[PDB]
Amino acid sequence: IQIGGLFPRGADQEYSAFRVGMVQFSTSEFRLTPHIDNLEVANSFAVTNAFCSQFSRGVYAIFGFYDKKSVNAITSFCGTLHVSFITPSFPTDGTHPFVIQMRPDLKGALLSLIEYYQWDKFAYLYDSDRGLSTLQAVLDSAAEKKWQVTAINVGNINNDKKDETYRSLFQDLELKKERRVILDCERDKVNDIVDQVITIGKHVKGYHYIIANLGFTDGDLLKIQFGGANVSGFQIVDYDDSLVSKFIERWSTLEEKEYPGAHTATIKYTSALTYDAVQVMTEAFRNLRKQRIEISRRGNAGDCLANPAVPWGQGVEIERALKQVQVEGLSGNIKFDQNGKRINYTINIMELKTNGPRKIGYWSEVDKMVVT
Amino acid sequence: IQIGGLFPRGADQEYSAFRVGMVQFSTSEFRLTPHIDNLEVANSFAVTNAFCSQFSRGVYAIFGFYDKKSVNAITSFCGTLHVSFITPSFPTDGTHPFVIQMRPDLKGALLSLIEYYQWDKFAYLYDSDRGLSTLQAVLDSAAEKKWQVTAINVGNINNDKKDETYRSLFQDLELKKERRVILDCERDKVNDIVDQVITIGKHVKGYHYIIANLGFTDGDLLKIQFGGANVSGFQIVDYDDSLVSKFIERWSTLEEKEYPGAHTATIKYTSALTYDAVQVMTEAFRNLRKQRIEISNAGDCLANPAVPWGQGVEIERALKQVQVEGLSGNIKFDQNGKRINYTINIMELKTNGPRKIGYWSEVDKMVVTL
């Protein structure tokens, strides 16, 4: 069963996690065979081309990553042609079809926590790249719950004055005597920022930071474990989980030059979801034999732009099979709604104490109350 | 010289403005011949297909429109393949190449005005559909100049509870006793917002509204000329201008069934820029003979590897170094296709009518009261 892979450049850990999943989840009676393409995922042209190529090859589904600058390109083609796209990238805001979204929604949990700490005046530092879905919720709810949010787009600082203007961003932000802050950026920025918070000595007592992403332990927490600032975040990989322990003991011992990014004690949530994604995909094709469904080409349709666009017949079966999969993985309960969004899922709430990161509770999609 | 046209559906006025420009700007020695495609511009699939169609036809440039949804699709293909795209849609935030952007940047002017009125607590009503480029500029600043902005995305209200929830959005917005307000919506959402403002009687004295777009007179401002509320906005078409008067006399008398959307006293700024766009293109191809530059089988846009059209950059250059006067005044571009050396009239709604109370220069950058 042929599938396509659209991996960003230097998505090493993720590709390794993907290959590991391939080995583990494929069997004798059943083997996925992926054609992998590596590309600049923010380039809509590159992405449209990568898609159209796989479409001629005759793939049945596509595992991939997309970016704010390329998401519409990919979803529009998937939706139009009935190719299902499975992805660990950010969930789409809209109810798009033929997109199975492995990443859970953080908007929900982040708002509950802001209330849990009973904040009502803070700062919000967002990266334009991530998608801006969350900026709005914080703003929408700051109207409702009357918060005084101080939003600043931080994604448009170039390496040139990286350290120079970050430092002077607190000569602009100390103005409102701002103490509680939320970080919503790609890991490279999050680190780049923390580094700067320390350098200027705003990691001391009196400051509280929330890391708006799903991998709290994913990066280097240590550098501020002892400044005296409060530091909170989210984690969808429970390393206390049996399933996850068994995984890491193999992962931590992989040939680091055969599996780049491996041979470590933690795994990035994106890499985790990439691996869980191989499980979901394999299971949905096993359920398509277990319903004696013929999803095979009897013929091949090769142009991405043929007009009129005629959707693949079996396309809708494959979308269904995927969305009605339920398994347990590195991210716990994997279960989808009609729109390919994740449900019945849990996010650990985390605090950075002096001994280390602590799971202080969880956020259920259902209960929805930070449970402690 | 062949060019492509990518028009949204029911972009009537704009297409008419386009055809008019075609007539007057083309000569004996020089004729642009457009292949026109009408499409759902928010559909990146549709838009990419259309682009690729024109690309095979062998067009030299493309005039068109794009949507927050579909802008990356377009710019990405244009950038990659070296086809130049001229457009009246919102300017791109980046420095994308091969995009000549006819619409000036409103971020600049809007911020100056907020200071001119010396506001520091207001509401900002934005439309998701337009793009959130401005939402940031306002918020980035609200940090800097310590404003207390109350932002609300209003683009995700469906026709069902249109009136129902707009009204109850001031049962949520009267909370902060909110009196100054910025509207950043399409004309359609703008007038809908305005009617509701009147229906509930918040168009009275004590309220001040700023209309964040380039067509202050473009819609019906009369409905609230006399409520007693302050109402300000922007205008890039100066109807007092000689060049524009000559235009409207013709425009206002066109066969309304031969030129839909015409036969009126005002013209929408998009239609204006559409028309100005025919001038800019025309000019740039005339300057390409006036430099004895040769440009002339095209191929598949999905050909791999992508090989850029050789003459492509020449055409991008010619376009970007064009300077003329049009319905929007001084048309002049920087290296990035963005507009420069331009002016925006500042406008207030008085009881006799809208009044040009000043201007905003890209250079002076004052709100330059007069």
Please name the residue that has the structure tokens 């469906």. B158
Q: Are B101 and B74 in contact (CB under 8 A)?
A: no
Q: Are B7 and B67 in contact (CB under 8 A)?
A: no
DSSP letter at A94 equals S
Backbone φ and ψ of B39, nearest 5°: -150, 165
Q: Which residues pair with A327 in a beta bridge?
A: A334
Instruction: Quote the CA–CA distance of B184 and B153 in Å, as a whole number.
Output: 10
Count, residues in chain B: 370
Backbone φ and ψ of A259, nearest 5°: -130, 80
Resolution attained, angstroms: 3.2
Backbone φ and ψ of A334, nearest 5°: -90, 110
The pairing of strands A208-211 and A230-235 is parallel
Angle in degrees, 0-180, between the axes of helices A269-286 and A315-323, rounded to the nearest 10: 120
Q: Is A333 helix (H, G, I), strand (E, B) or coil?
A: strand
Domain regions of chain B by residue span: 1-104+240-341, 105-239+342-370
Q: Return the HEC string of A4-72.
A: EEEEECCCHHHHHHHHHHHHHHCCCCCCCEEEEEEECCCCHHHHHHHHHHHHHHCCCEEEECCCCCCHH
CA angle, B286 as apex, B285 and B288 as ends, to 5°? 60
Looking at beta carbons, which residues of chain A come within 8 Å of B72? Answer: 44, 69-70, 72-73
DSSP B21-51: HHHHH--SS---EEEEEEE-TT-HHHHHHHH
Q: Are B211 and B190 in contact (CB under 8 A)?
A: yes
Q: Are A338 and A96 in contact (CB under 8 A)?
A: no
CA angle, A329 as apex, A325 and A334 as ends, to 5°? 40
Q: Are B345 and B235 in contact (CB under 8 A)?
A: yes
Looking at beta carbons, which residues of chain B come within 8 Å of A77? Answer: 44-45
Contacts of B124 (CB under 8 A, 6+ apart): B135, B138, B149, B150, B151, B152, B181, B182, B184
State the smallest CA–CA distance between residue A83 and chain B in angstroms.
14
Nearest CA in chain B to A171: B144
Residue B86 identity (one-letter amino acid):
I
Looking at beta carbons, which residues of chain A come within 8 Å of B76? Answer: 43-45, 48, 69, 73
Instruction: Quote the CA–CA distance of A32 and A324 in Å, as a whole number.
Output: 19
Instruction: Quote the CA–CA distance of A306 and A364 in Å, as a whole number.
Output: 45
> What is the CA B5 to chain-centroid distance, rounded?
17
Instruction: Quote the CA–CA distance of A112 and A55 in Å, as a whole number.
Output: 42
Q: Cβ of A76 and B153 within 8 Å?
A: no
Backbone φ and ψ of A197, nearest 5°: -60, -40
Instruction: Quote the CA–CA distance of B1 and B31 in Å, as a whole number.
Output: 7
Task: Burial-class residue B351 by CB neighbours within 10 Å (0-12, 13-18, 19+).
Answer: exposed
Residue among B23, B95, B35 nearest B63 (CA)? B35
Please name the residue that has the structure tokens 């659209």. A6
CATH of domain A1-104+240-344: 3.40.50.2300
Distances from the Cα of A117 to the Cα of A120, A129, A202, A349, angstroms: 9, 27, 20, 12
Residue among B210, B163, B216 nearest B187 (CA)? B216
CA dihedral defined by A5, A11, A13, A17, rounded to 10 degrees? -10
**Per the structure block, which two tokens stand in for B307?**
């090989």
Residue among B157, B109, B97 nearest B134 (CA)? B109
Task: Burial-class residue B294 by CB neighbours within 10 Å (0-12, 13-18, 19+).
Answer: exposed
**Per the structure block, which two tokens stand in for A66?**
């997309």
Q: Are B67 and B40 in contact (CB under 8 A)?
A: no
**Per the structure block, which two tokens stand in for A92?**
């789409």
Contacts of A237 (CB under 8 A, 6+ apart): A215, A244, A266, A267, A269, A272, A330, A331
Instruction: Quote the CA–CA distance of A274 and A257 in Å, as a whole number.
Output: 19
Instruction: Quote the CA–CA distance of B51 and B80 in Å, as a whole number.
Output: 12
Looking at beta carbons, which residues of chain A come within 8 Å of B151? Answer: 139, 142-143
Q: Are A369 and A112 in contact (CB under 8 A)?
A: yes
Listed as own residue / partner, the contacts of B286-295 with beta carbons closer than 8 Å and 24 or more positions apart are B286/B30, B287/B318, B287/B321, B287/B322, B288/B314, B288/B315, B288/B318, B289/B30, B293/B318, B295/B60
Q: Is B36 within 8 Å of chain A by CB?
A: no
Rg (CA), chain A: 21
Q: Is A82 left (phi over 0), alpha (psi -120 to 50) or beta?
A: left
Buried b (16+ CB within 10 A) or exposed e, A36-60: ebebebbbbbbbbbbbbbbbeebbb
Task: Burial-class residue A223 by CB neighbours within 10 Å (0-12, 13-18, 19+).
Answer: middle
CATH of domain B105-239+342-370: 3.40.50.2300
Residue A306 identity (one-letter amino acid):
A
Looking at beta carbons, which residues of chain B come within 8 Å of A76? Answer: 43-45, 48, 73
Nearest CA in chain B to A138: B151
User: Residue A255's CB: how many other CB atoms inside 10 A?
Assistant: 9
Q: Is A194 helix (H, G, I), strand (E, B) or coil?
A: helix
Q: Which method, experimentally, gave rise to this model?
A: X-ray
Instruction: Quote the CA–CA distance of A173 and A167 in Å, as a whole number.
Output: 10
Sequence-ordered alpha helix ranges (H) in chain B: 12-25, 44-57, 71-81, 106-116, 133-144, 162-167, 187-200, 242-251, 269-286, 312-320
DSSP letter at A107 equals H
Residue among B333, B313, B321 nearest B79 (CA)? B313
Q: Is A177 left (phi over 0), alpha (psi -120 to 50) or beta?
A: left
Backbone φ and ψ of B165, nearest 5°: -90, -15
CATH of domain B1-104+240-341: 3.40.50.2300
Sign of torsion, CA A185 A188 A189 A193?
A: positive
Sequence-ordered alpha helix ranges (H) in chain A: 12-25, 44-57, 71-81, 106-116, 133-144, 162-167, 187-200, 242-251, 269-286, 315-323
DSSP letter at A92 equals P
Task: Burial-class residue B14 by CB neighbours within 10 Å (0-12, 13-18, 19+).
Answer: buried
Q: Are A6 and A51 in contact (CB under 8 A)?
A: yes
Instruction: Quote the CA–CA distance of B217 and B238 in Å, as a whole number.
Output: 10
Residue among A9, A11, A10 nearest A277 (CA)? A11
> What is the CA B52 to chain-centroid distance, rounded?
25
The pairing of strands A326-329 and A332-335 is antiparallel
Q: Can you state the percent helix, strand and coil of chain A, rounding each to 5?
A: 35, 20, 45
The pairing of strands B121-126 and B180-184 is parallel
Q: Is B48 within 8 Å of chain A by CB?
A: yes
Residue A129 identity (one-letter amino acid):
D
Instruction: Quote the CA–CA distance of B80 and B308 in Å, as a whole number.
Output: 7
Sequence-ordered alpha helix ranges (H) in A154-241: 162-167, 187-200
Instruction: Quote the CA–CA distance of A340 and A238 in Å, as a whole number.
Output: 23
Q: Choosing among A80, A305, A307, A310, which should be mutated to test the B contact, i.e. which has the most B CBs within 10 A?
A: A305
Q: Which helix (H) or strand (E) holds A211?
A: strand A208-211
Instruction: Quote the CA–CA distance of A18 and A261 in Å, as a whole number.
Output: 12
Q: Is A306 helix (H, G, I), strand (E, B) or coil?
A: coil
DSSP letter at B10 equals T
Q: What is the largest CA-CA distance in chain A?
A: 68
Q: Which residues pair with A84 in a beta bridge?
A: A61
Q: Cβ of B175 and A146 within 8 Å?
A: yes
Residue among B161, B154, B204, B160 nearest B183 (CA)? B154
**Per the structure block, which two tokens stand in for A175?**
């103005």
Contacts of A165 (CB under 8 A, 6+ apart): A157
Which of B153, B176, B306 comes nearest A136 by C-beta?
B153
Buried b (16+ CB within 10 A) or exposed e, A104-143: bbbbbbbbbbbebeebeebbbbbbbbbbbbbbbbbbbbbb
Instruction: Quote the CA–CA distance of A174 and B179 in Å, as a whole number.
Output: 28
> What is the CA A17 to chain-centroid distance, rounded?
14
Residue A4 identity (one-letter amino acid):
G
Which of A52, A72, A79 comes nearest B72 by C-beta?
A72
Q: Are B220 and B120 in contact (CB under 8 A)?
A: no
CA angle, A71 as apex, A67 and A72 as ends, to 5°? 150
Assigned fold of A105-239+345-372: Rossmann fold (3.40.50)
Instruction: Quote the CA–CA distance of A150 and B147 in Å, as a whole number.
Output: 9
Sign of torsion, CA A192 A245 A99 A282?
A: positive
Instruction: Quote the CA–CA distance of A103 and A92 in Å, as a whole number.
Output: 10
Q: How many CB pairs under 8 A join A and B?
A: 95
Please name the residue that has the structure tokens 């795209």. B85
Q: Return the HEC string of B171-226.
A: CCCCCCCCCEEEEECCHHHHHHHHHHHHHHCCCCCCCEEEECCCECCCCCCHHHCC
> Quick check: do A1-104+240-344 and A105-239+345-372 share a fold?
yes
Instruction: Quote the CA–CA distance of B85 and B101 in Å, as a whole number.
Output: 8
Sheet holding B84-87, edge to edge: B33-39, B2-8, B61-64, B84-87, B99-101
Q: Is A157 helix (H, G, I), strand (E, B) or coil?
A: coil
The pairing of strands A346-352 and A230-235 is antiparallel
CA dihedral defined by A99, A100, A103, A108, rounded to 10 degrees? 80
